[PDB]
Amino acid sequence: NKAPAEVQITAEQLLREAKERELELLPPPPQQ
Amino acid sequence: KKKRKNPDLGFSDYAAAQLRQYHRLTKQIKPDMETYERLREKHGEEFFPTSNSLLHGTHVPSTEEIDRMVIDLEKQIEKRDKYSRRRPYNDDADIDYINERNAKFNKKAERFYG
Amino acid sequence: VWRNTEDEILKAAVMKYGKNQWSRIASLLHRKSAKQCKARWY
Amino acid sequence: IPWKVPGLPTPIENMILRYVKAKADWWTNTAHYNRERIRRGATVDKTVCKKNLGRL
Amino acid sequence: WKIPPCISNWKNAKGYTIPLDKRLAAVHINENFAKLAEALYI
RNA sequence: AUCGCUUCUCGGCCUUUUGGCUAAGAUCAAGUGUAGUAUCUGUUCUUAUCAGUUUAAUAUCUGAUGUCCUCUCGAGGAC
């Protein structure tokens, strides 16, 4: 169903999604 | 009763901040004229040496003394550790920074391009 | 034609890569070439 | 492109402008030289032909 | 003596996002065009 | 007012952070047929009996929604 969406997919949303995709920081070297 | 104030300014040279810190530490110290006179009556004229004048090999300190300087060391070290006050992790504003290096580079750019 | 999703990708892509790497950006987008991306930007 | 950086001390800007003029002189004098070699026929090297077409 | 940082339009070595505005910042017309064009219309 | 501790706010460092060069180093980006199932998604339903159709039962579907005066579908009453 093609029909005008509600809010939008503006850029800042993309930049925030990518910044929160924050998995490349990764887990710390394990203390033993 | 007493009153004074000292305002902070530009770090202009590391020397200025060092000097301020020395002022504070110097004002703190309180010396015992007892030990001074005790040390005095032993050595007398040796007390007043020019740069080049007089010489006695070494003055050996009671350990209790050494503890004073060690304690002051730890104090100044802590006070210096607090040099940079960190701004709390505020997520409230818009995020256009991929990581913390990028976030800080964007902040430096904010301060040079208005 | 141009769809708001795409040009909202393009704003971010230009924001990140810079204003001279049109082939990278064009690669972010399906069905766009670097010429059209550059045209839409300018 | 006209290059102008917002707040950048003048001594630095003069240093940079001086050195970019140095490199520009070197670059285009090399272009003149290689073009004469290519025109009269001396080099057949195939990286110089492309480097020189891009310079000119 | 503080030195602004460079944000280039060609190199983004570490892949950093910079807003369009700060990314961006880092004509004459003679008066004889009027006399020529109007002489031509006349 | 002074000293110390704690809480919040703000300023200053924040170079401690964009590996060098060239011909921006170079270049560029091409698939089903049939139905049908399921899942999302979007949406739509108090009204009062009763008769039937129907159904395992519901539902659906069909069909109307006590007289008399009177005042403003509404009201007090002879009933």
Coordinates of all heavy atoms in Angstrom, one line a residue, chain D residues 8-43:
Chain D
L8 N 43.7 32.0 11.2 CA 45.0 31.3 11.1 C 46.1 32.4 11.0 O 46.0 33.3 10.2 CB 45.0 30.4 9.8 CG 46.3 29.6 9.5 CD1 46.1 28.2 9.9 CD2 46.6 29.7 8.1
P9 N 47.0 32.4 12.0 CA 47.9 33.5 12.1 C 48.6 33.9 10.8 O 48.8 33.0 10.0 CB 48.9 33.0 13.1 CG 48.6 31.6 13.4 CD 47.2 31.4 13.0
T10 N 48.9 35.2 10.6 CA 49.4 35.5 9.3 C 50.8 34.9 9.0 O 50.9 34.3 7.9 CB 49.4 37.0 9.1 OG1 49.9 37.6 10.4 CG2 48.1 37.5 8.8
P11 N 51.8 34.9 9.9 CA 53.0 34.3 9.5 C 52.9 32.9 9.0 O 53.6 32.6 8.0 CB 53.8 34.3 10.9 CG 53.2 35.4 11.6 CD 51.8 35.5 11.3
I12 N 52.0 32.1 9.5 CA 51.8 30.8 9.0 C 51.2 30.9 7.6 O 51.6 30.2 6.7 CB 50.8 30.0 9.8 CG1 51.6 29.4 11.0 CG2 50.2 28.9 9.1 CD1 51.7 30.3 12.1
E13 N 50.2 31.8 7.3 CA 49.6 31.9 6.0 C 50.6 32.3 5.0 O 50.6 31.8 3.9 CB 48.5 32.8 6.1 CG 47.4 32.4 5.2 CD 46.3 33.4 5.0 OE1 46.1 34.2 6.0 OE2 45.7 33.4 4.0
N14 N 51.5 33.2 5.4 CA 52.6 33.6 4.4 C 53.5 32.5 4.2 O 54.0 32.3 3.0 CB 53.3 34.9 4.9 CG 52.4 36.0 5.0 OD1 51.3 36.0 4.6 ND2 52.9 37.1 5.7
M15 N 53.9 31.7 5.2 CA 54.8 30.6 5.0 C 54.1 29.6 4.0 O 54.8 29.1 3.1 CB 55.0 29.9 6.3 CG 55.9 28.7 6.3 SD 55.7 27.6 7.7 CE 54.4 26.5 7.2
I16 N 52.9 29.3 4.2 CA 52.2 28.3 3.3 C 52.1 28.9 1.9 O 52.3 28.1 1.0 CB 50.8 28.0 3.9 CG1 51.0 27.0 5.0 CG2 50.0 27.3 2.8 CD1 49.7 26.7 5.6
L17 N 51.8 30.1 1.7 CA 51.6 30.6 0.4 C 53.0 30.6 -0.3 O 53.0 30.3 -1.5 CB 51.1 32.1 0.4 CG 49.6 32.1 0.9 CD1 49.1 33.5 0.9 CD2 48.8 31.2 0.2
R18 N 54.0 30.9 0.4 CA 55.4 30.9 -0.2 C 55.7 29.5 -0.6 O 56.3 29.2 -1.7 CB 56.4 31.4 0.9 CG 57.8 31.3 0.5 CD 58.6 31.3 1.7 NE 58.6 32.6 2.3 CZ 59.6 33.5 2.3 NH1 60.7 33.1 1.8 NH2 59.5 34.7 2.9
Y19 N 55.4 28.5 0.2 CA 55.8 27.1 -0.2 C 54.9 26.5 -1.2 O 55.4 25.7 -2.0 CB 55.8 26.2 1.1 CG 57.1 26.4 1.8 CD1 57.2 27.2 2.9 CD2 58.2 25.7 1.3 CE1 58.4 27.4 3.5 CE2 59.4 25.9 2.0 CZ 59.5 26.7 3.0 OH 60.7 26.8 3.7
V20 N 53.7 26.9 -1.3 CA 52.8 26.4 -2.4 C 53.3 27.1 -3.7 O 53.2 26.4 -4.8 CB 51.4 26.7 -2.1 CG1 50.6 26.2 -3.3 CG2 50.9 26.0 -1.0
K21 N 53.8 28.3 -3.7 CA 54.4 28.8 -4.9 C 55.6 28.1 -5.3 O 55.9 27.9 -6.5 CB 54.6 30.3 -4.8 CG 54.5 31.0 -6.1 CD 54.9 32.5 -5.9 CE 54.9 33.2 -7.2 NZ 56.2 33.8 -7.5
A22 N 56.4 27.6 -4.3 CA 57.6 26.8 -4.6 C 57.2 25.6 -5.4 O 57.7 25.2 -6.4 CB 58.4 26.5 -3.4
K23 N 56.3 24.8 -4.8 CA 55.9 23.6 -5.4 C 55.2 23.8 -6.7 O 55.4 23.0 -7.7 CB 55.0 22.8 -4.5 CG 54.9 21.3 -4.9 CD 54.4 20.5 -3.7 CE 54.0 19.1 -4.2 NZ 53.9 18.2 -3.0
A24 N 54.5 24.9 -6.9 CA 53.8 25.1 -8.2 C 54.8 25.4 -9.2 O 54.7 24.9 -10.4 CB 52.8 26.3 -8.0
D25 N 55.8 26.2 -8.9 CA 56.9 26.4 -9.9 C 57.5 25.1 -10.3 O 57.8 24.9 -11.5 CB 58.0 27.3 -9.3 CG 57.5 28.7 -9.0 OD1 56.6 29.2 -9.8 OD2 57.9 29.3 -8.0
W26 N 57.9 24.3 -9.4 CA 58.5 23.0 -9.7 C 57.6 22.2 -10.6 O 58.0 21.6 -11.7 CB 58.8 22.3 -8.5 CG 59.3 20.9 -8.6 CD1 60.5 20.4 -9.0 CD2 58.5 19.7 -8.3 NE1 60.5 19.1 -9.0 CE2 59.3 18.6 -8.6 CE3 57.2 19.5 -7.9 CZ2 58.8 17.3 -8.4 CZ3 56.7 18.2 -7.8 CH2 57.6 17.2 -8.0
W27 N 56.4 22.1 -10.2 CA 55.4 21.3 -11.0 C 55.3 21.7 -12.4 O 55.4 20.9 -13.4 CB 54.1 21.4 -10.2 CG 53.0 20.4 -10.5 CD1 52.9 19.2 -10.0 CD2 51.8 20.7 -11.3 NE1 51.7 18.6 -10.4 CE2 51.1 19.5 -11.2 CE3 51.4 21.7 -12.0 CZ2 49.9 19.4 -11.8 CZ3 50.2 21.6 -12.6 CH2 49.5 20.5 -12.5
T28 N 55.0 23.0 -12.6 CA 54.8 23.4 -14.0 C 56.1 23.5 -14.8 O 56.1 23.3 -16.0 CB 54.0 24.7 -14.1 OG1 54.2 25.2 -15.4 CG2 54.6 25.6 -13.2
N29 N 57.2 23.7 -14.2 CA 58.5 23.7 -15.0 C 58.7 22.2 -15.5 O 59.2 22.0 -16.6 CB 59.7 24.1 -14.2 CG 59.6 25.6 -13.8 OD1 59.0 26.4 -14.6 ND2 60.1 25.9 -12.7
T30 N 58.4 21.3 -14.6 CA 58.5 19.9 -15.1 C 57.5 19.6 -16.2 O 57.9 18.9 -17.2 CB 58.2 18.9 -13.9 OG1 59.2 19.2 -12.9 CG2 58.4 17.6 -14.4
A31 N 56.3 20.2 -16.2 CA 55.4 20.0 -17.3 C 55.9 20.6 -18.6 O 55.8 19.9 -19.6 CB 54.1 20.6 -16.9
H32 N 56.5 21.8 -18.5 CA 57.1 22.3 -19.7 C 58.2 21.4 -20.3 O 58.2 21.1 -21.5 CB 57.7 23.7 -19.5 CG 56.7 24.8 -19.0 ND1 55.3 24.6 -19.2 CD2 56.9 26.0 -18.5 CE1 54.7 25.7 -18.7 NE2 55.7 26.5 -18.3
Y33 N 59.1 21.0 -19.4 CA 60.2 20.1 -19.9 C 59.7 18.8 -20.5 O 60.1 18.5 -21.7 CB 61.1 19.9 -18.7 CG 62.3 19.0 -19.0 CD1 63.3 19.4 -19.8 CD2 62.4 17.8 -18.4 CE1 64.4 18.6 -20.1 CE2 63.5 17.0 -18.6 CZ 64.5 17.4 -19.4 OH 65.6 16.6 -19.7
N34 N 58.9 18.1 -19.8 CA 58.4 16.9 -20.4 C 57.6 17.1 -21.7 O 57.6 16.2 -22.5 CB 57.5 16.1 -19.4 CG 58.3 15.5 -18.3 OD1 59.4 15.0 -18.5 ND2 57.6 15.4 -17.2
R35 N 56.9 18.2 -21.8 CA 56.1 18.4 -23.0 C 57.0 18.6 -24.2 O 56.8 18.1 -25.3 CB 55.2 19.6 -22.9 CG 54.2 19.5 -24.0 CD 53.3 18.5 -23.7 NE 52.7 17.8 -24.9 CZ 52.0 16.8 -24.8 NH1 51.7 16.2 -23.6 NH2 51.5 16.2 -25.9
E36 N 58.2 19.3 -24.0 CA 59.1 19.4 -25.1 C 59.7 18.0 -25.5 O 59.8 17.7 -26.7 CB 60.2 20.4 -24.8 CG 60.0 21.6 -25.6 CD 58.8 22.4 -25.2 OE1 58.5 22.3 -24.0 OE2 58.2 23.0 -26.0
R37 N 60.0 17.2 -24.5 CA 60.5 15.9 -24.8 C 59.5 15.0 -25.6 O 59.8 14.4 -26.6 CB 60.9 15.1 -23.6 CG 62.2 15.6 -23.1 CD 62.6 14.8 -21.9 NE 63.0 13.4 -22.2 CZ 64.1 13.1 -22.9 NH1 64.9 14.1 -23.3 NH2 64.4 11.9 -23.2
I38 N 58.2 15.1 -25.1 CA 57.2 14.3 -25.8 C 57.0 14.8 -27.2 O 56.7 14.0 -28.1 CB 55.9 14.3 -25.0 CG1 56.0 13.6 -23.7 CG2 54.8 13.8 -25.8 CD1 54.9 13.7 -22.8
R39 N 57.0 16.1 -27.4 CA 56.7 16.7 -28.7 C 57.8 16.3 -29.7 O 57.5 15.9 -30.8 CB 56.6 18.2 -28.7 CG 56.7 18.8 -30.0 CD 57.3 20.2 -29.9 NE 57.1 20.9 -31.2 CZ 57.5 22.2 -31.4 NH1 58.0 22.9 -30.4 NH2 57.4 22.8 -32.6
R40 N 59.1 16.4 -29.3 CA 60.1 16.1 -30.3 C 60.4 14.6 -30.4 O 60.9 14.2 -31.5 CB 61.4 16.9 -30.1 CG 62.1 16.6 -28.8 CD 63.5 17.3 -28.9 NE 63.9 17.7 -27.6 CZ 64.7 16.9 -26.8 NH1 65.0 15.7 -27.2 NH2 65.0 17.3 -25.6
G41 N 60.1 13.9 -29.4 CA 60.1 12.4 -29.6 C 61.0 11.6 -28.8 O 61.3 10.4 -29.1
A42 N 61.5 12.1 -27.7 CA 62.6 11.5 -27.0 C 62.2 10.4 -26.1 O 62.8 9.3 -26.1 CB 63.4 12.6 -26.2
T43 N 61.1 10.6 -25.3 CA 60.7 9.5 -24.3 C 59.5 8.7 -24.9 O 58.6 9.3 -25.5 CB 60.4 10.0 -22.9 OG1 59.9 9.0 -22.1 CG2 59.3 11.1 -23.0

